[PDB]
Amino acid sequence: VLSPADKTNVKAAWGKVGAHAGEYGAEALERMFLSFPTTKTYFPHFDLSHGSAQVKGHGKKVADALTNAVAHVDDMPNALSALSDLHAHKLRVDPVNFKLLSHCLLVTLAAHLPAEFTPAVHASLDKFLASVSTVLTSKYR
Amino acid sequence: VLSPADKTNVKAAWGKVGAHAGEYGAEALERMFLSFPTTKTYFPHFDLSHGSAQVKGHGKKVADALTNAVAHVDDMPNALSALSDLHAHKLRVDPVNFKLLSHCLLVTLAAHLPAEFTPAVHASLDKFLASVSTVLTSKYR
Amino acid sequence: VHLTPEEKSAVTALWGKVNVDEVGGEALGRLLVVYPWTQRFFESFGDLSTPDAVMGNPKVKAHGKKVLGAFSDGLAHLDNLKGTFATLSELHCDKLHVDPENFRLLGNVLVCVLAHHFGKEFTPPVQAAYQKVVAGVANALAHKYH
Amino acid sequence: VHLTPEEKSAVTALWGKVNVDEVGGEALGRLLVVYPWTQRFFESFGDLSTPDAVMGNPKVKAHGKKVLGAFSDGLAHLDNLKGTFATLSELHCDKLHVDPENFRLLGNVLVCVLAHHFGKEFTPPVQAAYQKVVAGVANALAHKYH
Ligand code: HEM
Ligand code: HEM
Ligand code: COH
Ligand code: COH
């Protein structure tokens, strides 16, 4: 459960992310494919070399969904409904890989937000990415 | 999320456990301590040898909580509220260990229920133990 | 992996009694029922929409038998599971694109199936020995992922 | 483990810029804040009630320094982490009863701390090299658990 203070911390941090959301989204994907190469088994149809249009494209889509979830943080089941059907019924990503992309999104935010990534905001962002992962994983069985 | 069919399958299977619930809880703990030795770090004050009254006593408590969760399966967060407080703020069991007990519970039910542990009942029971595990780790942070 | 000689003869003895075709078909079918996102790799197989359709599907039973067959051959080389399974490790990465977390899930479903099938003979020490073996085989099959 | 000489020299290069006392204090304090159930070993340490109390607690700082100094001395022996951390593994099992999942949580918080400290110098290849090192250290400290 996200506390009101967690929601304030996620909105402040993601506010600062702002217009770079798409660029941070691609960097987190690239950090995932290098650090955890088993996640590449879900993207065999992508050019996964550095700076490819497919990864930058996908990065922007991941990031807009997280922007949608921050905007509707009180109502994330209804907000991400379309995305939880798509991961459950069509992509079928094993749930263990959501923790690996959350950790690389957290690492990417750390590396770009030096003033804002306090202990308490780190806690709140980890907790927010675990709630997004739980919602995208909700309808798997 | 437990479907009406999953609730009928868990009430049927746990119904046929009935009075042996206590004995099956101890067996599941013993199975967990031998198969996953890292879970023994939460019980340094117990005698964990085979046949130990402490593991049997503990097993009966685990099982009575799961019997209470089956009876209240539409309202499991309130029924298990004092046990999520307990595991979140005092015992502070790392959340990965709940998946190890849940697997050992499933193995125990499989070993004692040859006709009831159907592929569909197996699915329903795995969903139920994951829902109990999610409630018991709800208040961790 | 490293088994004590009384874990090795627990694994060996139990496995002499396993009908590999029947337990294979049950283990792969229960994987596809209990964890339905693993159906991802098998949509060439037919009707996988209900538990009864998955457990009676002939291509699930045939493939289940193929898988447990290769697993059986790894029980004969428990001292070097990585060398035994290197070619199949490479095939599941490069050509089939199977997330190695699926090998861990099948491992645990196969322990549930052995427990279901052998009842009280599948005692907590025998389970412990088969959990080290299926973690070892999962490990071996994931080793050449890149 | 197995690092390539270019991954070893990237780990080594970056660690030469680390204040081990300060990064230790920060990594163990953020472990205790982000994952509060890891506070269960530390109620001997006083006030851990808020983020600021945790991060300013001198005992948490002293323990983080001791933990990260042993980690640092372990980067000189990347060829043989299991030998270097065998006594510390035994000790964390038999006497301190620390669930080995806490070493994996500390390893992931240590990588977010290095990313926060080093910013854009912590590139995706450097992260990947440090993920192998912290998974190797966690493995090594878990190896003699029983
Ligand atoms: C923080 C959680 C994640 C978010 C918010 C997220 C969001 C999205 C979005 C927005 C799409 C595009 C849907 C469309 O075209 O309408 C997508 C597709 C996809 N996702 Fe996820 N996702 C997440 C985690 C994952 C993970 C963990 C993996 C696998 C390692 C994954 C694998 C995929 C793949 C395979 C696609 C399809 C790409 C394509 O065919 O072009 N996703 N995701
Ligand atoms: C299905 C999940 C579980 C259930 C329903 C459950 C239930 C319980 C119950 C009923 C108690 C006794 C409460 C009391 O004293 O009033 C308890 C205590 C405890 N549980 Fe859990 N538990 C679960 C999972 C776990 C796991 C996974 C671990 C560790 C691997 C764990 C570790 C403990 C320990 C350390 C105690 C205290 C034992 C003592 O000192 O007497 N529990 N649990
Ligand atoms: C859910 C994913 C899954 C898992 C758990 C899994 C687990 C295991 C496993 C672990 C116990 C072992 C020993 C095997 C062993 C095999 N697998 Co897979 N396999 C899996 C998905 C596949 C698929 C996909 C194929 C290809 C079948 C086809 O359609 O040709 C495969 C093929 C094979 C083959 C045939 C290869 C050939 O060249 O024809 C062997 C043998 N294996 N597999
Ligand atoms: C959250 C639990 C936690 C973690 C993750 C952890 C992770 C790590 C880790 C991972 C990079 C390393 C290399 C160490 C290294 C050490 N730990 Co721990 N330790 C932990 C809890 C403890 C505790 C508790 C003690 C005892 C402190 C005391 O008695 O003062 C300990 C003591 C130590 C000591 C002192 C040994 C002695 O001779 O007294 C070293 C060195 N360690 N620890």
mmCIF file of C-alpha atoms in Angstrom, chain B residues 37 40-42 44 91-92 94 96-97 140-141, chain D residues 34-37 40 97 99-101 105 145-146:
data_model
loop_
_atom_site.group_PDB
_atom_site.id
_atom_site.type_symbol
_atom_site.label_atom_id
_atom_site.label_comp_id
_atom_site.label_asym_id
_atom_site.label_seq_id
_atom_site.Cartn_x
_atom_site.Cartn_y
_atom_site.Cartn_z
ATOM 1 C CA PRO B 37 18.022 -24.699 4.872
ATOM 2 C CA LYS B 40 16.111 -22.290 9.561
ATOM 3 C CA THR B 41 17.729 -18.879 10.312
ATOM 4 C CA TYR B 42 14.317 -17.679 11.620
ATOM 5 C CA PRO B 44 17.441 -20.633 16.062
ATOM 6 C CA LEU B 91 9.228 -11.580 13.217
ATOM 7 C CA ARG B 92 10.236 -9.716 10.045
ATOM 8 C CA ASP B 94 11.903 -11.852 4.405
ATOM 9 C CA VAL B 96 10.875 -14.695 -0.292
ATOM 10 C CA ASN B 97 10.436 -17.318 2.416
ATOM 11 C CA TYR B 140 5.998 -4.796 5.762
ATOM 12 C CA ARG B 141 6.638 -1.221 4.590
ATOM 13 C CA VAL D 34 13.965 0.788 2.030
ATOM 14 C CA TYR D 35 13.601 -2.728 3.380
ATOM 15 C CA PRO D 36 12.648 -2.163 7.077
ATOM 16 C CA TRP D 37 12.460 -5.896 7.981
ATOM 17 C CA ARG D 40 15.421 -7.164 12.932
ATOM 18 C CA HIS D 97 21.262 -16.297 11.696
ATOM 19 C CA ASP D 99 18.845 -15.026 5.955
ATOM 20 C CA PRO D 100 21.089 -14.860 2.847
ATOM 21 C CA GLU D 101 18.418 -12.909 0.949
ATOM 22 C CA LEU D 105 19.065 -6.812 -0.997
ATOM 23 C CA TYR D 145 24.756 -22.220 4.973
ATOM 24 C CA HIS D 146 23.194 -25.520 6.173
#
